[PDB]
From Swiss-Prot, chain A:
This is Large ribosomal subunit protein uL2. It comes from the Bacteria. Keywords: Ribonucleoprotein, Ribosomal protein, RNA-binding, rRNA-binding. InterPro entries: NA-bd_OB-fold (IPR012340), Rib_uL2_dom2 (IPR014722), Ribosomal_uL2 (IPR002171), Ribosomal_uL2_bac/org-type (IPR005880), Ribosomal_uL2_C (IPR022669), Ribosomal_uL2_CS (IPR022671), Ribosomal_uL2_dom3 (IPR014726), Ribosomal_uL2_RNA-bd_dom (IPR022666). The lineage of its organism: Bacteria, Thermotogati, Deinococcota, Deinococci, Deinococcales. Residues 254-272 have a biased composition (Basic residues). It comes from Deinococcus radiodurans (strain ATCC 13939 / DSM 20539 / JCM 16871 / CCUG 27074 / LMG 4051 / NBRC 15346 / NCIMB 9279 / VKM B-1422 / R1). One of its GO terms (biological process) is cytoplasmic translation. GO terms for cellular component: large ribosomal subunit. Belongs to the universal ribosomal protein uL2 family.
Curated annotation (Swiss-Prot), chain B:
One of the early assembly protein it binds 23S rRNA. One of the proteins that surrounds the polypeptide exit tunnel on the outside of the subunit. Forms the main docking site for trigger factor binding to the ribosome. Disulfide bonds: none annotated. The lineage of its organism: Bacteria, Thermotogati, Deinococcota, Deinococci, Deinococcales. This is Large ribosomal subunit protein uL23. It comes from Deinococcus radiodurans (strain ATCC 13939 / DSM 20539 / JCM 16871 / CCUG 27074 / LMG 4051 / NBRC 15346 / NCIMB 9279 / VKM B-1422 / R1). It comes from the Bacteria. It holds the Pfam family Ribosomal_L23. The gene is rplW.
Curated annotation (Swiss-Prot), chain C:
Pfam families: Ribosomal_L34 (PF00468). The lineage of its organism: Bacteria, Thermotogati, Deinococcota, Deinococci, Deinococcales. Coiled coil: none annotated. Gene3D superfamilies: 1.10.287.3980. It comes from the Bacteria. GO terms for cellular component: ribonucleoprotein complex; ribosome. Keywords: Ribonucleoprotein, Ribosomal protein, RNA-binding, rRNA-binding. Part of the 50S ribosomal subunit. Contacts protein L4. This is Large ribosomal subunit protein bL34. Belongs to the bacterial ribosomal protein bL34 family.
RNA sequence: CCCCCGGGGGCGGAGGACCGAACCGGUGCCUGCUGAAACAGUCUCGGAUGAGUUGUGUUUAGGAGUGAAAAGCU
RNA sequence: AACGAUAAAAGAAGUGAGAAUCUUCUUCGCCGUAAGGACAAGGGUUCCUGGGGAAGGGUCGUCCGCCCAGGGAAAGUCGGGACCUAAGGUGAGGCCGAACGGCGCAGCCGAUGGACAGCAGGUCAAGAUUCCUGCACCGAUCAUGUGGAGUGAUGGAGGGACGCAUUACGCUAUCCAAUGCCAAGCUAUGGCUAUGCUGGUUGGUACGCUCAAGGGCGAUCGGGUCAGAAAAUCUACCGGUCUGCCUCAGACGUAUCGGGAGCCGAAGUUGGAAACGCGACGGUGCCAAGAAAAGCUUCUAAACGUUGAAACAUGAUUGCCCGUACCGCAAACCGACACAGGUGUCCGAGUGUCAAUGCACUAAGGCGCGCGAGAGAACCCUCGUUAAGGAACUUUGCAAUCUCACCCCGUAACUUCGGAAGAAGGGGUCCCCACGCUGCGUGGGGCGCAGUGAAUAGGCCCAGGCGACUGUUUACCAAAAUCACAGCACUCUGCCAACACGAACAGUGGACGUAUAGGGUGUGACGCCUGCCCGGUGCCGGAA
C-alpha cells in the first residue's frame, strides 16, 4: 500500500506517500541520536560544490552499525522497526542479550521480535551477519563490505540486492544492483535478503517543494542561462550545439572512470 | 591607600537631604570596587557600613573656545551606615 | 527605503577593529600605513 | 473510523484549498519629475500554513561570489 | 517658486523692549491595533532645574531636541560576566604549501538558545523588581544542637532533550450588566425628586481536618557476562513477582500588610463573557521525522576517614564586575534636512456590526503636523451631483461608474467527478406587540423615497491564443507566453565514486549518502502518442 488522495487541490491528486503502519511510532534511541544535523548546504570553503542543495526540513543522524562484526556470536531481538530520514530505506532497532542497543538496516520481510544472529558460523537466516565464504551460492544479500572491517558500501538502499555467483581462492563473485559483477574477499560480511522498504521508487512527489521538504533546491537548466554563465548560453530563442556540462565535456556517453588498480577486481563484465 | 580611593563628597541638594537619613554620597575612583570602597569608608570614618550601591557616570561633553571638548568620567557611590550614623558631622 | 548603513556595534568592531587588523599582515599594513600618516582615527576603536 | 444498501447519513478536520487584516508584494491609472522622496503617495490590485515572513549570530567576492536565470545582485 | 500632507481652530488671561506663534484657562477638530504604552538595536546628555536669545528653527520667538551652568543615573534576586554549549571562529601536537600563508582532533571562544534565588506598594524637579517600608527567597563561611558516620570524582548511567496542524476539560488576567454595596452633591430647561445622574466597587503574603478540573507514576527480588574502559549497591537486556499515591493551577474563608473614590479613609455583592496566558511535558491525527552541552539525579575508581560525618534546625556574617537617565514606528535610530520613506518584539479598553486586531464613533493617553491673513478670476490637482442619450470616446470601456455584507430560494455547457460556483438569477434586511423555541422563528400592527438607512464588503457572461497548476523574476520603464515545477527521458558514476573548490600525495563538498543513490543534459501536470535519414560532426566499441 501507499497513500493516494482525492483531487481536492490541483496538486495532491498525482501526489503519493508511503505507508507507515509497519513502523513503530517511537522516539529514536537517545544514545544513538548523535544529533549532527548541521546540513552542509552544498558549500565547501563557503563555496558551492554540489550545486542545488537547499535547506529542507531538519534531521538527526541515526548511528547505524555496519560492520556488525564485533558482536559475533550473540543473539539479538528485533524491537521496533523505525523510520529514518537519512537512509530512506527503513532501519530496525534491536537489543542484544547483554543489553547493548544498535540499529541495523531493515531487510525486506523482517518482523518485530525476530531473532538476529552474527558471527562466522551463523546460519543463513534473514538478517544475519554472515561472511561471504559461508554464504550459500545464489543467495541474495545486501549491506556488503568491500574490505573486511569498515565495509558496508554495497547494497544499502531500498530493495537493493547482491546475488552471489561462483567462488574462488578467497574471492567471491557477486551481482551488484547496477548490474556489474565484482570480486570481494570471502571474509567480508553480508546481510541475508534484499533491502526493506522494497518499493520506495513508486512514491510520487506530487508538487514542487515536496522536493524542498527533501532539501533539493530548484535545478536550473543551462539553456535558460547566458553565454557567460553556462555553455548552453543564449541566442534569441532555444536550441543546442555540442551538448556539454556546466564546465565542459560530454555527459551523454563519455566513459568517466580512470585507468587504475582494482579494475582487475571488477573483472567480470560491467554495464553501468 | 584608602584615603586616595575616596574622591570628594557629592554636593547636591538631593545628596544633602540624604545626609539627614544617615545616607552619605561621594565620588570615588571609577576603577575601584564595592568591597574596597566600603572598607575604605569605614577605615576612614570608623563606622559600620551596612549598605553600598555604586554607579559609573560618564563625563559630560562640554566644549570651550570652539574646540570640541571631552568627558571627565566619575563613579558616585552611595552608602548607608549602621545606627551609629555619624560622620565627621561636616554636613552643610 | 531601507538604506545602506544600518549601525551595529558588534559588526563595526568585529570587522574593522584594532583586534581584527592585527589578525593578518595586510591589516597590520593598514595600521602602520595610517600611523605613518599620523592620523589618530587609526581604526574604528577611536 | 461508525451506521444503512460504490452510494446516503454520522463524525472527523486534510490542504504549495478559498475570502480577508496585520505582514510580505508591486497590478493599472493618476499625482509627483529644481519631488515630502536619488524610485515614493492616494486609489486599485497579488500572496496571505507555505517553495511562507522576520530578528539576532555567522560563511561565500572580482574572472570571483551568488542567482526558481534578468548579464540580475554583489 | 516655495515655506514639506486639506487632522481645523477660536476667545479670554498672563509675561515681555517686543507676541497669530511662549505660559495659563475655557471650548472646538484629529488619532485611538494609534498618530496610546513597554522594550531591543542604534544615538549619546538629547533627561530635570535655573538662566540665554547670536546663529540652528523653513516666518516669529519671551520658546525649543538650540547655547551656558548645576544636578540626575543606585541591584546577592531584572539583562550580560565570574556557568554551558550551536553555526561560525580559533586551535599545542598533527597534515600541506616559492614566501606571507592554507587545513586540522581534542580543547577554547562564540546567544539569536539552555540553567538560575523576590513580590507588593511608596516616592526626587529628574532613578526604581535597584532607593525607603512591609514581608520573602538563594548560594557561601562560621557557631550552638540533633545527627553521632560515609563522603561519594576531569569517568559510567538517567535527565536535560525539543516537529507541524487540530482539539477536550478547568481557570485567571480582563471585560460587561444590574433597583447589590459605598461616596458625593445637584437638580431647573417641558418632565424626573430617585428605582435619576456621577464615581469607586480589591492587590501581596501566611495559615486552612474547606471546594476543585487537570496533570505525573507502575514497583521491587534475582540471572547472565559477551554491553556502558575497569568498577558499580546506578543504568541497559532478560526472566519471578502486588483502581491506588502525589500535585496544586485556581476559587473560598480567616488574618495581616497595602491600595482605594473622596472629604484621614467608604464599599468591597450577585449574574454573564473570556485569551495565543496558566493547569501541563494533556489528547488525537499527520510526514516532510523535528540541536548540543552544563546545571540536576544516580554509581563506584582514587583519596580521606570510620568517638569532632552526609544531612537538617536556629543564629550570625557575607553578597564582586558591567548595563539602568532620555529618545526608542521617530524631530533624538537609518535616510546630507526638526525629510509624507524605512526599523525586530510585547500590551493595545468600550458601543454597534455572524466573528474580528475589520469598519464607524469614542476611553485612558497623545496630538491640530513651526508662516500667517484675505480673495473667491483663467488654468491645475483631489472630490460631489448631473437633463435626454449610453461606448457614438478611444489604440484599448484606459479611467470612472455599476455590483457589494449576512440569511433563503435557484443555478449551465464542460469535467481529471474535487470542480466549474459566490455560475447566472430572484427574494429578505428596520420599529412595536403577542406566541413558540436555548437570539432566533411564526403571526399581527407601525413609519420613511429608502430599513447590511451612515462606514467597511464581488459587476457578470460567451468565445479564443499561451502556459497545466500554487509559486519565481529584470532593487530604479518589462511580472509575462520568462524561470522553476511534479512527471518523463538520455547518459555518467563500484566508492579514497563520477563531479566540483583548491598554492597541496593537504583538507573538504558530494555524504557520515552507495546504483530504489549521486552528478550532467533536455523536456515540462494529465491523455493519445513520439515517424524517415548514421553520409557529415560528436560519442561507444572494434584495433588487419
Ligand atoms: Ca437620468
Ligand atoms: Mg483513498
Ligand atoms: Mg557558479
Ligand atoms: Mg529536474
Ligand atoms: Mg536568458
Ligand atoms: Mg563558454
Ligand atoms: Mg546554445
Ligand atoms: Mg540577453
Ligand atoms: Mg528561433
Ligand atoms: Mg562545474
Ligand atoms: Mg543595596
Ligand atoms: Mg572601544
Ligand atoms: Mg581619541
Ligand atoms: Mg458535527
Ligand atoms: Mg493558500
Ligand atoms: Mg474557485
Ligand atoms: Mg510596502
Ligand atoms: Mg521582488
Ligand atoms: Mg483574487
Ligand atoms: Mg490564490
Ligand atoms: Mg569565468
Ligand atoms: Mg510641496
Ligand atoms: Mg491662542
Ligand atoms: Mg505689561
Ligand atoms: Mg526684535
Ligand atoms: Mg498653527
Ligand atoms: Mg507650543
Ligand atoms: Mg485665568
Ligand atoms: Mg508607540
Ligand atoms: Mg544603548
Ligand atoms: Mg546610556
Ligand atoms: Mg526639556
Ligand atoms: Mg521647565
Ligand atoms: Mg530649559
Ligand atoms: Mg533669535
Ligand atoms: Mg552668543
Ligand atoms: Mg528664525
Ligand atoms: Mg550595578
Ligand atoms: Mg532588597
Ligand atoms: Mg543571568
Ligand atoms: Mg565553552
Ligand atoms: Mg570546529
Ligand atoms: Mg584556521
Ligand atoms: Mg540570549
Ligand atoms: Mg532568575
Ligand atoms: Mg513628585
Ligand atoms: Mg522618567
Ligand atoms: Mg516598584
Ligand atoms: Mg478553554
Ligand atoms: Mg439604570
Ligand atoms: Mg452606577
Ligand atoms: Mg550510596
Ligand atoms: Mg471576599
Ligand atoms: Mg565542557
Ligand atoms: Mg527607563
Ligand atoms: Mg519622518
Ligand atoms: Mg516591518
Ligand atoms: Mg485585545
Ligand atoms: Mg476594539
Ligand atoms: Mg466586538
Ligand atoms: Mg481601524
Ligand atoms: Mg509621541
Ligand atoms: Mg475655487
Ligand atoms: Mg478626483
Ligand atoms: Mg435629481
Ligand atoms: Mg442600457
Ligand atoms: Mg471615432
Ligand atoms: Mg468605436
Ligand atoms: Mg494593451
Ligand atoms: Mg478599469
Ligand atoms: Mg453531463
Ligand atoms: Mg455537480
Ligand atoms: Mg471560467
Ligand atoms: Mg410608505
Ligand atoms: Mg420594504
Ligand atoms: Mg449603510
Ligand atoms: Mg490570431
Ligand atoms: Mg504560469
Ligand atoms: Mg523593473
Ligand atoms: Mg534586489
Ligand atoms: Mg512593473
Ligand atoms: Mg588524502
Ligand atoms: Mg570527507
Ligand atoms: Mg521548455
Ligand atoms: Mg523522434
Ligand atoms: Na430643578
Amino acid at each position: 500500500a501507499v497513500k493516494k488522495y482525492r483531487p481536492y487541490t490541483p496538486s495532491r491528486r498525482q501526489m503519493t506517500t508511503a505507508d507507515f503502519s509497519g513502523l513503530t511510532k517511537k522516539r529514536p534511541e537517545k544514545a544513538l541520536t548523535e544529533a549532527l544535523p548541521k546540513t552542509g548546504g552544498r558549500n565547501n570553503r563557503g563555496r558551492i560544490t554540489s550545486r542545488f542543495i537547499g535547506g529542507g526540513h531538519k534531521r538527526l543522524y541515526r548511528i547505524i552499525d555496519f560492520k556488525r562484526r564485533d558482536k559475533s556470536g550473540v543473539n539479538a531481538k528485533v524491537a521496533a522497526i523505525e523510520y529514518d530520514p537519512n537512509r530512506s530505506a527503513r532501519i530496525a532497532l534491536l537489543h542484544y542479550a547483554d543489553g547493548e542497543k544498535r540499529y541495523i538496516l531493515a531487510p525486506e520481510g523482517l518482523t518485530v521480535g525476530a531473532t538476529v544472529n552474527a558471527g562466522p558460523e551463523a546460519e543463513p537466516k534473514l538478517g544475519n551477519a554472515l561472511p561471504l565464504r559461508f554464504v550459500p551460492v545464489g543467495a541474495v544479500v545486501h549491506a556488503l563490505e568491500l574490505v573486511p572491517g569498515k565495509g558496508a558500501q554495497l547494497a544499502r538502499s531500498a530493495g537493493t540486492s547482491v546475488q552471489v555467483q561462483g567462488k574462488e581462492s578467497d574471492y567471491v563473485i557477486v551481482r551488484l544492483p547496477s548490474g556489474e559483477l565484482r570480486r570481494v574477499h570471502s571474509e567480508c560480511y553480508a546481510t541475508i535478503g534484499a533491502v526493506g522498504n522494497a518499493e520506495h521508487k513508486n512514491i510520487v512527489l506530487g508538487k514542487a517543494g515536496r522536493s524542498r521538504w527533501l532539501g533539493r533546491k530548484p535545478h536550473q537548466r543551462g539553456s535558460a542561462m547566458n553565454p557567460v554563465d553556462h555553455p548552453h548560453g543564449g541566442g534569441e530563442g532555444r536550441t543546442g550545439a555540442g551538448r556539454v556540462p556546466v564546465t565542459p565535456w560530454g555527459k551523454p556517453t563519455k566513459g568517466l572512470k580512470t585507468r587504475r588498480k582494482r579494475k582487475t577486481s571488477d573483472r567480470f563484465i560491467v554495464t553501468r | 591607600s584608602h584615603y586616595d580611593i575616596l574622591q570628594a563628597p557629592v554636593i547636591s541638594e538631593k545628596a544633602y537631604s540624604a545626609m539627614e537619613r544617615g545616607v552619605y554620597s561621594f565620588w570615588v575612583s571609577p576603577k575601584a570596587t564595592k568591597t574596597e570602597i566600603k572598607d575604605a569608608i569605614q577605615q576612614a570614618f570608623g563606622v559600620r557600613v551596612i549598605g553600598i550601591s555604586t554607579m559609573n557616570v560618564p563625563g559630560k561633553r562640554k566644549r570651550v573656545g570652539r574646540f570640541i571638548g571631552q568627558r571627565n568620567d566619575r563613579k558616585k557611590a552611595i552608602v548607608r551606615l549602621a545606627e551609629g550614623q555619624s560622620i565627621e558631622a561636616l554636613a552643610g | 527605503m531601507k538604506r545602506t548603513y544600518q549601525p551595529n556595534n558588534r559588526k563595526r568592531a568585529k570587522t574593522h577593529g584594532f583586534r581584527a587588523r592585527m589578525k593578518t599582515k595586510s591589516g597590520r599594513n593598514i595600521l602602520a600605513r595610517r600611523r605613518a600618516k599620523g592620523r589618530h582615527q587609526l581604526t574604528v576603536s577611536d
